[PDB]
């Protein structure tokens, strides 16, 4: 875990306006707004690397309501597009969405869910995000 986090943090790409990392209170606000419980490991991801910019994928964030990756807006768009309400998007990819199950499994929903999945958000970060 420490390994993957370090890899992402050190690979962070500079941008004009740096992204902000949320605190626990901010995550609670998002959960309440969506009336859902964010899986623990997913919450850990948001609290440790959601300020990171890297590769060709831009995962969800919770600190800038005007961002195209703002979780509440991404959820609304994904759920309206067909993503099961029980799945919380972690990263948009075109019209597809990498989403997280209540138990933490990451799935890929094709504009139904495909056959590929990742054991955790960290597996996804290491094997998909860091490989982009
Ligand atoms: Ca299960
Ligand atoms: Ca599962």
Q: Residue 16 is part of a domain; what is its CATH number?
A: 3.40.1580.10
HSE at residue 49, side-chain half, CA atoms within 13 A, is 29
Structural method? X-ray
In the chain, how many H helices and how many E strands? 5, 4
**Which ligand does the CA of 100 lie closest to?**
2
Which structural domain range is residue 35 located in? 1-132
Cα-to-centroid distance, 39 and ligand 2 (Å)? 11
Question: Which is nearest to 118 in space by CA: 90, 94, 95?
Answer: 90
Q: Where are the alpha helices (DSSP H) in the chain?
A: 2-11, 24-34, 40-49, 71-81, 121-124
Residues 6+ apart with CB under 8 A from 97: 78, 81, 83, 89, 91, 108, 109
Strand partners, 131: none
User: How far apart are the C-alpha atoms of 122 and 116, rounded to whole Å?
Assistant: 15
Longest dimension (CA), the chain: 38
Q: Please give the resolution of this entry in Å, rounded to 1 decimal.
A: 1.6
List of long-range contacts for 95-101, beta carbons under 8 Å, 24+ apart = 98/124, 98/128, 100/39, 100/42, 101/39
**Which ligand does the CA of 105 lie closest to?**
2
Total domains in the chain come to: 1
SS (H, E, C) 81-92: HCCCCCCEEEEE
Is 93 annotated in some ligand binding site? no
Is 105 annotated in some ligand binding site? yes
**In contact, 1 and 126? CB cutoff 8 Å:** no
Is 131 annotated in some ligand binding site? no
Breaks (C-N over 2.5 A) in the chain follow: 111
> CA of 86: how far to CAs of 1, 35, 74, in Å?
26, 11, 14
Element (H, E) at 68: none
Cα-to-centroid distance, 104 and ligand 2 (Å)? 6
Cα-to-centroid distance, 54 and ligand 2 (Å)? 27
Strand ordering across the sheet containing 96-100: 88-93, 96-100, 106-109, 113-118
Cα-to-centroid distance, 82 and ligand 2 (Å)? 19
């Amino acid at each position: 875990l420490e390994e993957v986090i370090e890899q992402l943090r050190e690979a962070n790409e500079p941008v004009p306006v740096p992204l902000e990392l949320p605190d626990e209170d901010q995550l609670v606000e998002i959960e309440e707004q969506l009336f859902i419980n964010i899986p623990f490991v997913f919450k850990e991801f948001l609290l440790t690397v959601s300020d990171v910019v890297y590769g060709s994928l831009e995962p969800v964030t919770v600190t800038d309501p005007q961002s195209h990756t703002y979780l509440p807006e991404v959820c609304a768009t994904a759920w309206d597009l067909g993503v099961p309400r029980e799945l919380i998007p972690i990263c948009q990819d075109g019209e597809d969405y990498y989403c997280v199950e209540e138990d933490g499994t990451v799935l890929l929903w094709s504009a139904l869910v495909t056959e590929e999945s990742w054991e955790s958000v960290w597996h996804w970060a290491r094997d998909v995000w860091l490989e982009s």
